[PDB]
Design an enzyme around this catalytic site. Structure first.
Site, PDB file in Angstrom:
ATOM      1  CB  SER A  45       0.388  -5.695   4.743  1.00  0.00           C
ATOM      2  OG  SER A  45       0.428  -7.079   4.392  1.00  0.00           O
ATOM      3  CE  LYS A  48       1.026  -8.524   7.433  1.00  0.00           C
ATOM      4  NZ  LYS A  48       1.597  -8.813   6.077  1.00  0.00           N
ATOM      5  CB  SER A 105       4.729  -6.751   4.323  1.00  0.00           C
ATOM      6  OG  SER A 105       3.361  -6.474   4.485  1.00  0.00           O
ATOM      7  CD  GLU A 141      -1.796 -11.085   5.720  1.00  0.00           C
ATOM      8  OE1 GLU A 141      -2.193 -11.588   4.660  1.00  0.00           O
ATOM      9  OE2 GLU A 141      -1.574  -9.863   5.835  1.00  0.00           O
ATOM     10  CE  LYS A 209       3.322  -3.689   6.740  1.00  0.00           C
ATOM     11  NZ  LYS A 209       3.398  -3.758   5.251  1.00  0.00           N
ATOM     12  CB  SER A 210       2.904  -0.207   1.705  1.00  0.00           C
ATOM     13  OG  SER A 210       3.915  -1.192   1.716  1.00  0.00           O
ATOM     14  N   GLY A 211       0.348  -1.668   1.998  1.00  0.00           N
ATOM     15  CA  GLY A 211      -0.470  -2.852   1.735  1.00  0.00           C
ATOM     16  C   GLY A 211      -0.720  -3.030   0.272  1.00  0.00           C
ATOM     17  CB  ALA A 212       0.090  -4.860  -2.281  1.00  0.00           C
TER      18      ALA A 212
END
Ligand SMILES: [Ca+2]
Length: 263
Positions: A45, A48, A105, A141, A209-212
């Protein structure tokens, strides 16, 4: 208390897979510290933010308006759409969608915004067009999270991402109001608490901004600094392991603590 590169290497030892890291000076763009800076990692993510950069570029070009309202249907909804699922009757504005994509997210929001520019390949083209010949988006997504080991789809490198983020936040690729909007959305991130925010001292600024992915992968991109003002970019990616979410989160937090303590 460990030195940051020491800590990054330790995290990799603990987790398995790879950990990538870069710290850039925001003002000058100089690399301050790095590990695996030119190796590829899934963005998850974190893309984004780049997507919203493209949207804002279009706003600055007179081709889009943040107030434009997008109606969508239940058929457009995909996994992890906590904001968009609530607006089936009213829709959401382009600016609201970027807020949802960055701060929460939201996946449907990201897909909607991707349609505005013509899809993943067109985000790749936007990146190419601003001098980033490395970063690529290939899927929508939620498939772009599948993180197949060396499959270079939907990947960046720490240095490419950090460099591109700096170009979006600073300098003149975007207008001052658009640069400001982008960092505002990142500052308002609601879903990255376990990560760098967990190490952040009082009075500091962070925009992130994080992602997983379910298995294997985690990441964060951030502009942060003391005294209410960002002064560095930090990018951390991890992939390729069988670590739990709690252990991935803990390692990022510990990298963060080291970075803050050695600032
Ligand atoms: Ca190693």
């Amino acid at each position: 208390h460990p030195e940051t590169l020491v800590k990054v290497k330790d995290a990799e030892d603990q987790l398995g897979g790879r950990v990538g890291y870069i710290e850039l000076d925001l003002a000058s763009g100089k690399i301050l510290e790095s590990f695996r800076p030119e190796e590829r990692f899934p963005m998850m993510s974190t893309f984004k933010v780049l997507l919203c950069g493209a949207v804002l570029s279009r706003v600055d070009a007179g081709q889009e308006q943040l107030g434009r309202r997008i109606h969508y249907s239940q058929n457009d909804l995909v996994e992890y759409s906590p904001v968009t699922e609530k607006h089936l009757t009213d829709g959401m504005t382009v600016g609201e969608l970027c807020s949802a994509a960055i701060t929460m997210s939201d996946n449907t929001a990201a897909n909607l915004l991707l349609t505005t520019i013509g899809g993943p390949k067109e985000l790749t083209a936007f990146l190419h067009n601003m001098g980033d010949h490395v970063t690529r988006l290939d899927r929508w997504e939620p498939e772009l999270n599948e993180a197949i080991p060396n499959d270079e789809r939907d990947t960046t490198t720490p240095v490419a991402m950090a460099t591109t983020l700096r170009k979006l936040l600073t300098g003149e690729l975007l207008t001052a109001a658009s640069r400001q909007q982008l960092i505002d959305w990142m500052e308002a991130d609601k879903v990255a608490g376990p990560l760098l925010r967990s190490a952040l001292p009082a009075g500091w600024f962070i925009a992130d901004k994080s992602g997983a992915s379910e298995r294997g992968s985690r990441g964060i991109i951030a502009a942060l600094g003391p005294d209410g003002k960002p002064s560095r970019i930090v990018v951390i990616y991890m992939t390729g392991s069988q670590a739990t979410m709690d252990e991935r989160n803990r390692q990022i937090a510990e990298i963060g603590a080291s970075l803050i303590k050695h600032w």
